[PDB]
Structure 1
Amino acid sequence: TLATKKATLVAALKDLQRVTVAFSGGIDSTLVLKMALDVLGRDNVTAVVANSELFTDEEFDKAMSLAEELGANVQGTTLDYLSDDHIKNNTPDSWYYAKKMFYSRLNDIAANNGSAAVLDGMIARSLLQEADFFKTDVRALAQELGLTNWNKVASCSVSSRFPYGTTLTHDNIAQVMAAEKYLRSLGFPTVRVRFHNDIARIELPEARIGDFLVFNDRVNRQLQSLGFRYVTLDLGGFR
């Protein structure tokens, strides 16, 4: 039951005393941040949201305000992922070196915040994963605390828009990021603009491709103005 699960989670959390919470802006890291605040108090919980070139400014700006709106002291930290050569040249193991850079910045922040642990929201300690929470359990408990505001747009690293071996630059990341922002504002929350130098290859859930037709010409000109020469739609669909 959920009452049994939350007792386990608070009990496990009650041991830690001082915590630093890696705050995504999603609901699971939202559950940990506000339940940690509930048991240890505002002054013993630090919410950290990472700002970097590989994720959107919107996801960062929404999560920063979402942590205060939960009542936490919140700290922005900026990671320079592109300064790791594995990330900069988009090797297939590059997810490893990026997560190595991220967890050491938060562990380094936890050392100077006098914290006993770094906490994350996976379904570093994932206490939500330890209490056997499902997406259903996190939904009942987050409403149960009156929580209504999370970033339900799950974002991935922009690295996945680039082929292995391609060098990421500030300019081509921005170009890909601006194209996906425009596509999202037309009503397509799940979208990918895959980068192939002068070709943009747009991935959409197949069930949306019919709805998309009315935007064909506007998307063509918009992504061309962002620097692509050819703007195309993958017939295979999203992933």
Structure 2
Amino acid sequence: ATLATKKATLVAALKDLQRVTVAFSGGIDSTLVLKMALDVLGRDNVTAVVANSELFTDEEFDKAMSLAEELGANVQGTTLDYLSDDHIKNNTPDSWYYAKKMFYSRLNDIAANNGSAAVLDGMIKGARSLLQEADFFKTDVRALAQELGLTNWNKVASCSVSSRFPYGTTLTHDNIAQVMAAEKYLRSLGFPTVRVRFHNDIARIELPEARIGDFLVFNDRVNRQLQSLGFRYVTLDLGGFRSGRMNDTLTKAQLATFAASW
């Protein structure tokens, strides 16, 4: 019902699971659970685990680590070898599941050796997703994180760099470095939400459509900058990032049909 009741449903499961390990990504979803666990259970009874890996930037790792210390949490860096998994290494469509399976297996073992009763993630509307078990929607997380005074969290969602390569394409340290350096370079010009999709020698840039207007001034520099990172053709996706999201009634449903044809 009200936010208070959903918050009370949250408190009740925390006090029932005496100790917990928090799977902490830095986003607002995990910021909420990590904060709530601390103030219901205490700094001595909650441990923060921030995964480190080759599929995420050193910046998202560094940022989540500082956010967890500054929430008063005792934080733990943990290091996963996703690219030693042939599904992930070869980016089959089922990569995402084996990568999560490697993930939660690590927290299973880590929670085992710190006395925890469950492993909590931050998923909303055998780990526990109390936000989902308390009927928290997106609107409820923002409100609760507002009333708790939390102000710092990943404003732009982090995503596994697998999303930038086609399926079947094998990921290499050269690949990822190529894609990560190109997205880092774009972000430095003022495009925080950006994807650089990798297509062998074509680099294919997705911007928020609202921003494409402002991007025209950086064409030549982006083109020469990304070429020197090894792309022959630097191109701009005319659909933008999350195409169809802002299309009118008729062209979002058509754009979905094309999205489903692949």
Tell me the TM-score normalized by structure 2.
0.88
Q: Secondary structure at the match of 2:191?
A: coil
Distance 2:8 2:55 in 1: 37
Alpha-carbon distance, 1:205 to partner: 2.2
Q: Secondary structure at the match of 1:193?
A: strand
Distance 1:139 1:234 in 2: 31
Distance 1:165 1:27 in 2: 32
The one-character-per-residue Cα deviations of 1:98-153 (angstroms, maximum 9, x if unpaired) are 01100101111111111111001111111011111122222222222221111111
Distance 1:16 1:24 in 2: 21
Distance 2:41 2:4 in 1: 19
Q: Secondary structure at the match of 2:131?
A: helix
Alpha-carbon distance, 1:60 to partner: 0.8
Alpha-carbon distance, 1:160 to partner: 1.1
Distance 1:108 1:195 in 2: 35
Distance 2:42 2:206 in 1: 44
Q: What is the root-mean-square deviation of aligned Cα atoms in Å?
A: 1.0
- Percent of residue pairs identical: 100
The one-character-per-residue Cα deviations of 1:37-83 (angstroms, maximum 9, x if unpaired) are 10111011000010111112111111000001000100000101000
Distance 2:139 2:207 in 1: 27
Alpha-carbon distance, 1:221 to partner: 1.1
Corresponding position of 2:212: 209
**Aligned runs of 1:27-66 on 2, under 5 Å?**
27-66=28-67
Distance 1:58 1:159 in 2: 17
Greater shift, 143-152 or 54-63, is seen at: 143-152
Distance 1:61 1:47 in 2: 14
Distance 1:175 1:115 in 2: 39
Greater shift, 38-47 or 129-138, is seen at: 129-138
Alpha-carbon distance, 1:215 to partner: 0.2
Distance 2:147 2:57 in 1: 30
Alpha-carbon distance, 1:236 to partner: 2.3
Corresponding position of 2:172: 169
The number of residues matched between the two structures is 238
Q: Secondary structure at the match of 1:127?
A: coil
User: What are structure 1's unaligned runs of at least 5 residues?
Assistant: none
Distance 1:4 1:190 in 2: 34
Alpha-carbon distance, 1:229 to partner: 1.8
Greater shift, 68-77 or 129-138, is seen at: 129-138
Alpha-carbon distance, 1:207 to partner: 2.4
Greater shift, 146-155 or 83-92, is seen at: 146-155
Q: Secondary structure at the match of 2:93?
A: coil
Tell me the TM-score normalized by structure 1.
0.97
The one-character-per-residue Cα deviations of 1:166-210 (angstroms, maximum 9, x if unpaired) are 110011101101101111121212211111112111112222211
Corresponding position of 2:149: 146
Distance 2:131 2:239 in 1: 36
Distance 2:35 2:73 in 1: 8
The one-character-per-residue Cα deviations of 1:20-42 (angstroms, maximum 9, x if unpaired) are 00001111111111110101110
Distance 1:168 1:207 in 2: 31
Alpha-carbon distance, 1:234 to partner: 1.6
Corresponding position of 1:233: 236
